[PDB]
C-alpha cells in the first residue's frame, strides 16, 4: 500500500482508465469550445489539445478503485465495463490510487506525446486505447512475445 507505482496485474486496467479519461476530456473540450465540424471531425488546436491532455491527469481519480473478482484484485471504474455489471461490487477508492493513476497518466503523455495521442483520439476511443495499451508490448498486450 506504500508504493507510488501501479501494481503489475493492474497496469492494463489503469491504462484503459487513462485512455478513457483522456478521450472524455478531449471530447468535452471539443463540445465546450463549439469546435467546427469539418470533414467529420472536431479538431482542437495544438495548444488546446496539449493543455487539455496535460491537465486531464490532474483530475479527481476518486471514481476508480480496487475490488476482488473471482479471488484476484482488479481496478475498475468508468469506461472499464462493456455494459452495466449484473452484480453489486464493492471497491476501495482514494488512499494511494489517485497518486498512482495520475502518475500513470502523466507518464503516458511523455511516452507517446500529446500530438500522437490527439491523432488517435480523432480516430476514436478504441484507437486511443490501442495506442497507449495495445500492440506487442502495451500493458494490455495479448501476445506472449518470444524471449
Q: Is beta strand 41-42 parallel, antiparallel or unpaired with respect to 72-76?
A: unpaired
Q: At what angle do helices 11-32 and 97-112 cross, to 10 degrees?
A: 70
Nearest in space to 22 (alpha carbons), one of 127, 99, 96: 127
The span from the CA of 87 to the CA of 94, in Å, is: 23
Three-state SS at 50: helix
Quickly tell me which residue has 498512482 as its cell.
100
From residue 82, give the alpha-carbon distance in Å to each of 6, 85, 128.
Answer: 23, 8, 16
Q: Is beta strand 41-42 parallel, antiparallel or unpaired with respect to 65-69?
A: unpaired
What ranges do the domains of the chain cover? 8-133
Phi, psi of 76 (to 5 degrees): -145, 170
* DSSP state at residue 87: S
Nearest in space to 31 (alpha carbons), one of 119, 39, 23: 23
Q: Is the separation of the CB atoms in 35 and 131 below 8 Å?
A: no
Phi, psi of 118 (to 5 degrees): -65, -40
The experimental technique used to determine this model is X-ray
Quickly tell me which residue has 493543455 as its cell.
51
Amino acid at each position: 500500500m506504500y508504493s507510488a507505482h501501479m501494481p503489475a496485474h493492474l497496469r492494463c486496467d489503469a491504462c484503459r482508465a487513462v485512455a478513457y479519461q483522456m478521450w472524455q476530456n478531449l471530447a468535452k473540450a471539443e463540445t465546450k469550445l463549439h469546435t467546427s465540424n469539418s470533414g467529420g471531425r472536431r479538431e482542437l488546436s495544438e495548444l488546446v489539445y496539449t493543455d487539455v491532455l496535460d491537465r486531464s491527469c490532474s483530475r479527481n481519480w476518486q471514481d476508480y478503485g480496487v475490488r476482488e473478482v473471482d479471488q484476484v484484485k482488479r481496478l475498475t471504474g468508468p469506461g472499464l465495463s462493456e455494459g452495466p455489471e449484473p452484480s453489486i461490487s464493492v471497491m476501495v477508492t482514494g488512499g494511494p490510487w489517485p497518486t498512482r493513476l495520475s502518475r500513470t497518466c502523466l507518464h503516458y503523455l511523455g511516452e507517446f506525446g500529446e500530438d500522437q495521442i490527439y491523432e488517435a483520439h480523432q480516430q476514436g476511443r478504441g484507437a486511443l486505447e490501442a495506442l497507449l495499451c495495445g500492440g506487442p508490448q502495451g500493458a494490455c498486450s495479448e501476445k506472449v512475445s518470444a524471449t
